[PDB]
Prior knowledge:
It is classed as toxin inhibitor/toxin. The complex is a heterotrimer, with two copies of chain A and one copy of chain C. Chain A is an alpha+beta fold.
Amino acid sequence: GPHMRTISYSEARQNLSATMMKAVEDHAPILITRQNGEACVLMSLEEYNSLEETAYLL
Amino acid sequence: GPHMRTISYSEARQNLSATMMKAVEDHAPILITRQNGEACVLMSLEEYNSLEETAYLLRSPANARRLMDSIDSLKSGKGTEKDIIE
Amino acid sequence: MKLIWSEESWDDYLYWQETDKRIVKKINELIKDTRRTPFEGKGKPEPLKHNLSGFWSRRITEEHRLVYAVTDDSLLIAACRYHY
């Protein structure tokens, strides 16, 4: 099957470390959904900076 | 180096709910660091979608150039008014 | 609300006009919708950052985006085609 790209907040609480490692490993963001509130995205610092560098026109 | 608020793995994990809610409320990112080095940024979906769409439009040099010239003109009031060709 | 275009977006628009009428209709629908609700609706409206602050982006196709800004008086169209 495909690597997970989503996880609930409830599950994330107890698997945060593994989740962080996965976002870093695949160099792809993971969405943390929230039953009531708003979802958040977790991504490696490297991917985050690269993204800002682009949106900044180098 | 980074220019964002930092939080330890343990504090974030113990207070994940509050951390996510603040990220959403403030529209600001936060860096979660493990005491072993690993570090990830957490941000609201809304902020992520905004940043990704911006990078997307500038990723292509040809598109970035045109969009920058186009925005420049528009901000300068040099834009021409035209209706939609139905 | 008035429609102001740059040479870039105007060329983009005419390109579609003489290239793919299907895309034209999509652009018009988006413009008409943005005109009604500038920051909400069709095309998954998205606010842009940094050098693009103030501008917004909506989906014409998975590739092409309607980029625009809004003043107290009109709609500024920055683009309606994605370039390589």
